[PDB]
Amino acid sequence: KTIQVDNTDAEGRLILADALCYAHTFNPKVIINAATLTGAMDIALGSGATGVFTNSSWLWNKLFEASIETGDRVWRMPLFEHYTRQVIDCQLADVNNIGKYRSAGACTAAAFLKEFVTHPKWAHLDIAGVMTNKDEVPYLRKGMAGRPTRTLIEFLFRFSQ
Amino acid sequence: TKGLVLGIYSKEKEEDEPQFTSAGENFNKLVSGKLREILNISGPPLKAGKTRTFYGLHEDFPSVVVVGLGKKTAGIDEQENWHEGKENIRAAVAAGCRQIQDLEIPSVEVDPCGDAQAAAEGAVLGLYEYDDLKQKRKVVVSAKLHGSEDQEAWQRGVLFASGQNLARRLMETPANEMTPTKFAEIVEENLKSASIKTDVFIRPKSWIEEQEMGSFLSVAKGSEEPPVFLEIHYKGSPNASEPPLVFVGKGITFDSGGISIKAAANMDLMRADMGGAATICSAIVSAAKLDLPINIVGLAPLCENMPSGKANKPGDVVRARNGKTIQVDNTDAEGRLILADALCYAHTFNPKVIINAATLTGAMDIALGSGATGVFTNSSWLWNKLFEASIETGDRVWRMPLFEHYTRQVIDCQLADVNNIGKYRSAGACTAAAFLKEFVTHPKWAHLDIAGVMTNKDEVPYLRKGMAGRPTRTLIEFLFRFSQ
Amino acid sequence: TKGLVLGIYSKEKEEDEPQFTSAGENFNKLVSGKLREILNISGPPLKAGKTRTFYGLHEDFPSVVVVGLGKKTAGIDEQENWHEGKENIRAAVAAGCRQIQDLEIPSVEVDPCGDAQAAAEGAVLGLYEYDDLKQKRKVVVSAKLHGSEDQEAWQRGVLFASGQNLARRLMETPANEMTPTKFAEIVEENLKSASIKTDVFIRPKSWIEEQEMGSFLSVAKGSEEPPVFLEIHYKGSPNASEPPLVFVGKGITFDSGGISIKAAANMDLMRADMGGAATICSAIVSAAKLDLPINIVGLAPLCENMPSGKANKPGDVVRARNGKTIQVDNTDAEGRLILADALCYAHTFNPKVIINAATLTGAMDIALGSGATGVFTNSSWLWNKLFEASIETGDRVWRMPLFEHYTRQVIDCQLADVNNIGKYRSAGACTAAAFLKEFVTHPKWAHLDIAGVMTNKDEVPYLRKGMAGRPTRTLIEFLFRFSQ
């Protein structure tokens, strides 16, 4: 697939396109990616929760249940064709790396990633809003947060049982 | 002359050719196979939402527009959270009616396409245009059901669509015409027309003052346009004492930002900052037309937000109806100021549910755009009812978080009990919702931030470019199901 | 499937019905009047630029698209400075061809509409689309003249339009593919395919250094992409010694602004900052194809403008080929820097005229937008020839002033002979032209600032959204007339 690089700063989705493609070669049970992808996600939910875009409600529920236990929360965001339409509308190539509008930046970014995924159980975690901590999470000093590492570990533990 | 809109589905694997609807096949037979013949000659098959026009097939229908309906059995799409078949019908019929109008034909008969309500919604929503102030206008088209079998369903669709179009008219009209007073008067005439079991109170400034609505008053004083507090009642329950459902809508007729003035680019769209009031009032009008067996109260504080020698000043502290003080750090975060007072007043009715709608934050647009209305609620039962209703209407809703995490950022206030803007710039829609919550104690409250669905370019196929009137039908559907 | 495009004029006061073209009435006669009957049944008359489709009228043409041509006797419009009849034809034919393509029909015959060249231009320019890098593409349409009477005129239109389309291709192609070297190679192959009486020299950086083109070199050094100086010769005159006409074009394959970096919004359009080179080179290729009896030389300095550890720094002083020093106050005013050296080199050919084209200033866009190319010239004779040619092609030009008033603002310089930006923002296109003039001593020089006509949205009806390739046809027409 060809990609029109209209904005060089929308680079995360460019490197993820190739990694997601390579992920399919392992014939995996699930594919879960995490990225400090968009400033839009921060404007959307801030540090309250990691945004999760997934084509599997079963997968959403497992991540959600794990977050309840860890306290490092997740919140579902939409994967709609409405957003896909705005990234495949492209002057020169198959897909554009930025949407035709500023609205729903995190959603159009997720739609871009989806054009590189055919797996039935895929989840994209936009962690841009939980990159840092000031005083929101009481038990983390000011600085980089490392979220939602514990939620991923809990998900893996439960899955293995 | 009269035009005709007919549907055809996408061909199924086992089928030899794409199948017309019952009405399409009947017409084909009426014209001795000429419709099928000409469609075949015209080339490639018609896909969902596409159209093709054939002339002179029958003396009574000089122009026949065939529209693609997609897969006949398309039902609820688990990935899109909507009934796909209904959405396909709405889009296809709208496209077909637009073609007939471009041909300057004044009357059109429409194929029910297996779902007359959806067909009517596509026709009535699709043809709508606010052109009262223009000298050059498109031909006025009168759309009617082709056949008579599904008339009740067709009429229901016309009703739902008309409710949304009233919201669109109110939102689109320029603010120098659509003042707080004018808005109230239009809602009044429509509600009384809908049912005699109604009461309308166009409350003046003196009443607003007696009610101690200091937060709402602070926003209104900057402008010379008189503010009003619109209160409407629909007494549909058999039991007069049955607790009502209360709806609240943000009614800023024009938002310039006040002293914390807005940038010039596209500020004209702020004439629709009263969209919250438009959608809830229109939903109530429609509920009354439907004669729903429930009691409902609508509340809409209305005023302009303008800069002047007596306008709100950053840092000013105002007192809400409940006695809680608010530090107005930014005069352009005025929606939450007027809603604080309306939400307090909503509790006096001892309601079953409280639902408010508002074009509250630009942050909501950045978050979800026009894909869905953001819903903040302390009740998962309420969320599910709104969600289920949205699947039927196609006018989607998506849940947003109501966490103390966000409350902490608005109660951290230098001078007062609560600050009208958060301590940080992140999660603007969430902190705005947290602010509203500080004025709510009810167990079943939902806040709808409709800022991202205020307008349509071409995302929703069946709405022309302009104010959208979303999500009026979802509110009407919620009310209908609630009453059953 | 085979399609047919036919034209119809607007009805005159004393006519009973609007008149078809000769081809339209011939087809109507062939089908015993069925074309007129169905057009009448379909409703309102077709106005200029509008279309309507009729199916199954004849076995050889399952799809017939009728297009409105406007007033039949529409000639030169003194208010618009163009031949209106030709513009109406280009628009109508393009619209008709787009409909044929939407129907996925691979071949179409086109009514010459009283002016085969204009008809061909509308079809070829209208159907063009740069889609080499996409998996999903529209059906390739093969447009040909309907009938056998106006073959030469039709092919002339195909040739003129093809020249413009080559320019559009070069402009639209992403900069990572369309490098200085690639541009030079593509122009080389097209010119050689056009005529054997051609010579091409893709001059390397070593030659640029020998030529002491310090101003051009200063812009190129910031990027890793090698720069080249394209020099092309078309030897069309019967007399080998006849002085040539010289064309010069700005070839910035990508303009990031350099150290004086551009803002992000829409910076992708800067892949077309080599439009001046594209248009002048394409005009020469077309002149060669037509075998015009004249000698022509084309010059195009090509390079990228990028930021790096070795790029031009604001305040740096560079020396042009003619010995003049230039103070580079803004690295993003790079077009005038590369043109200074190319214009100097142009004088070595003892030319009859010197014409340069460049996407030079945003100021030109603020001035005239896409309405017309701005022309600065020291020769009224030259202005008039360009103006007259534009009336015929419809791709308009508009004169801009070459006054000492502007020169004064660029020679007022702290460190050098001339500053690359004016002392004020006012008249940006005029001060830019004044800068170029300091490198020209020729009596017949014209500078075309094409920045405003770089792209098309919907302004020129017969060009789809994208890079425009303007004013290629106006340059070709100028050359044709000059040769006669």
Ligand SMILES: CC(C)C[C@H](N)P(=O)(O)O
């Ligand atoms: C603020 C931050 C999360 C932005 C991303 N790094 P982007 O520039 O790739 O969108």
Ligand SMILES: CC(C)C[C@H](N)P(=O)(O)O
């Ligand atoms: C863009 C729009 C939704 C902004 C709100 N009217 P505010 O200025 O009150 O946040």
Ligand SMILES: CC(C)C[C@H](N)P(=O)(O)O
């Ligand atoms: C908008 C465009 C025409 C600007 C020129 N490339 P400049 O940056 O060289 O002025």
Ligand SMILES: [Zn+2]
């Ligand atoms: Zn980035």
Ligand SMILES: [Zn+2]
């Ligand atoms: Zn990044």
Ligand SMILES: [Zn+2]
């Ligand atoms: Zn309005």
Ligand SMILES: [Zn+2]
């Ligand atoms: Zn505001």
Ligand SMILES: [Zn+2]
């Ligand atoms: Zn507002």
Ligand SMILES: [Zn+2]
């Ligand atoms: Zn290019």
Ligand SMILES: [Zn+2]
């Ligand atoms: Zn530049």
Ligand SMILES: [Zn+2]
């Ligand atoms: Zn440039």
